[PDB]
Design a protein around this ligand. Structure first.
Ligand SMILES: CC(C)C(=O)COc1nc(N)nc2nc[nH]c12
Length: 291
């Protein structure tokens, strides 16, 4: 750590404090993430060093010193949560939403082709730059370190973007969980409000059910056999997506629906999503960022 000068605390991450820092020899500005160390975790993290893509925040190095672990990442100046709050009066323009979604799908397609999932996608870990790029931060860390109920500073880890199969107790969930999360994020960018802002696991589930309908064996074969499925769940009808994400045109609503399919095996893949007609006119606008 003596090789880095802390510039400023960025915040409190899932696993530990996060600092903006400068490398003393090369001059590089980086994000340093303390991870509050099993050999298995070191080996997993080590694998992430090679999982490089332009839409994945680059893992520069891993520093393990005195039973303390620090991850050194590419630094970006803003996150999507902050950008969305800043863009709340007018909304993020559809071409920019589309660009961001397209880029995020490319990052997912890459990592998913290597069988690596994120598992905790959320606006706070989607980072943006002045050039119109967006990148996924913290990819693969959930498998390395787990996703806790509370962070190291006791903050509640959000449930808002969690896939139903996770909430229903599926042990061996897949890359589809990331597609679900991204679909939730897509909807939030469009509407300027979280899609499913649950404040407990059951509230999360029931919010999903109230919008998408309570899942059953017709739409999700096997669902009634999942560990946390209860036959006593209320039965709500599915809403039309025209009511759920209004501004959004039929191509976007079609794609969102496929990203929000209940059955993970039927949920669209990132690679198939990239081919969807919604991206026919995709472009790369530059965001208004005041840093
Ligand atoms: C929620 C907050 C505490 C956090 O995890 C901040 O994370 C990060 N912030 C910046 N600017 N660049 C990064 N590169 C990788 N992760 C990054």
């Amino acid at each position: 750590m003596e090789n880095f000068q802390k510039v400023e605390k960025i915040g409190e991450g899932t696993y530990g404090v996060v600092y903006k820092a400068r490398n003393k020899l090369t001059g590089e500005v980086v994000a340093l993430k303390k991870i509050r160390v099993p050999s298995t975790a070191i080996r997993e993290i080590s694998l992430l060093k090679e999982l490089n893509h332009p839409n994945i925040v680059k893992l520069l190095d891993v520093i393990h010193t005195e039973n303390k672990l620090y991850l050194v990442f590419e630094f970006l100046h803003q996150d999507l949560k902050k950008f969305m709050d800043a863009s709340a009066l007018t909304g993020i323009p559809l071409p920019l939403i589309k660009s961001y979604l397209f880029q995020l799908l490319q990052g997912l397609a890459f990592c998913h082709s290597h069988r690596v999932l994120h598992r905790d996608l959320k606006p706070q870990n989607l980072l943006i730059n002045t050039e119109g790029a967006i990148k996924l931060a913290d990819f693969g860390l959930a498998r390395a370190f787990g996703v806790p109920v509370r962070t190291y500073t006791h903050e509640v880890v959000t449930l808002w973007y969690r896939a139903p199969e996770i909430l229903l107790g599926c042990k061996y969930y897949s890359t589809a969980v990331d597609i679900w999360s991204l679909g939730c994020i897509f909807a939030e960018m469009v509407t300027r409000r979280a899609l499913f802002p649950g404040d407990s696991e059951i509230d999360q589930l029931f919010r999903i059910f109230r919008t998408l309908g309570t899942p059953d064996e017709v739409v999700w074969p096997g669902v009634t056999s999942m560990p946390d499925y209860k036959p006593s769940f209320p039965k709500w009808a599915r809403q039309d997506f025209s009511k759920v994400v209004p501004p959004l045109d039929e191509d976007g609503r079609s794609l969102l629906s496929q990203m929000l399919h209940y059955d993970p095996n039927k949920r669209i893949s990132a690679k198939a999503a990239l081919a969807h007609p919604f991206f026919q006119d995709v472009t790369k606008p530059v965001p208004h960022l005041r840093l």
